[PDB]
């Protein structure tokens, strides 16, 4: 139930897009978008049935700036979702987040004496692990990008 949108030359491209999930009342599970001077590739997962997914893949094409909408859900995708978790870096409990960032195989970008910041990347199954497994240590502030998908293309 996830959608990739490619859009064209306008400003506030998201406002056309994030409108027509709200004004259509069909909730987005997550969203992220690599905007540029004229191009942007949205990746929107919408927690709805495949019937209402069939609407919003075409109702988003009722917008004008959308160059392409492809429901990427049926494909074998690569759902990769970054999550820059800032964790309380207390060395009584930092000492196991060491491997518990090595397991998820993520860099640790900035460390303080009470705040380290990791860069967990990939499958949302692995992301909801970290959102639960590293929740057992006191989390300062999770920020996460949206799930991004692509075609595992073969012919």
């Amino acid at each position: 139930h996830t959608i990739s949108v490619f859009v064209g030359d306008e400003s506030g491209m998201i406002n056309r897009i994030a409108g027509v999930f709200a004004r259509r009342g069909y909730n987005i599970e997550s969203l992220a978008v690599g905007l540029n001077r004229d191009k942007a590739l949205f990746t929107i997962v919408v927690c709805g049935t495949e019937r209402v997914l069939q609407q919003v893949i075409e109702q988003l094409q009722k917008l004008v700036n959308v160059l392409k909408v492809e429901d990427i859900s049926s494909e074998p995708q690569v759902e990769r979702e970054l999550m820059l978790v800032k964790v309380n870096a207390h060395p009584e409990s930092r000492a196991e987040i060491m491997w518990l960032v090595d397991t998820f195989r993520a860099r640790v970008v900035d460390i303080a004496e009470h705040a380290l910041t990791i860069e967990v990347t990939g499958d949302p199954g692995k992301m909801i692990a970290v959102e639960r497994n590293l929740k057992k240590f006191q989390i300062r502030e999770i920020v996460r990008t949206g799930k991004i998908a692509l075609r595992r293309e073969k012919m």
Partner: protein, 169 residues
Amino acid sequence: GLLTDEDTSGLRSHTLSLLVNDIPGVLNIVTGVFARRGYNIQSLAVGHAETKGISRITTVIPATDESVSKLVQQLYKLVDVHEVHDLTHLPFSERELMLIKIAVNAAARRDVLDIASIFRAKAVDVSDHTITLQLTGDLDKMVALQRLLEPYGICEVARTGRVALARES
């Protein structure tokens, strides 16, 4: 016209870490402000924050901090915004994944994965038609790979936009 373009920054390029409720339309109330304040949104990446029930939007706005002070308190005029943080005048992590499908042959795939080994890009999916990298890090490493993969048969660069937290260090 296949690939997403190069980079998502200019000179001004302020970053605002929003912190909003998990309302189903809460993105459109927030970028509704960026539109209604006449701001282009250069990059944006939403997601669920540490307290499950609220969200967190990390934006990129090309506006100087005088105009951003006309936005950070203006985004406070929204109901769902708990806080905004002008991270741009602070040191801050700037990590952004970037899924780059590249159509390559067999021998050129050798001369791509090595570049992906330079950037510590986990080549998440490969075929014979193509290979899809997945690098992560600051936007300069993002634009360096896309400046270096324009020689190769690039495909849909499904980026994700600058995600930020102000480091304490």
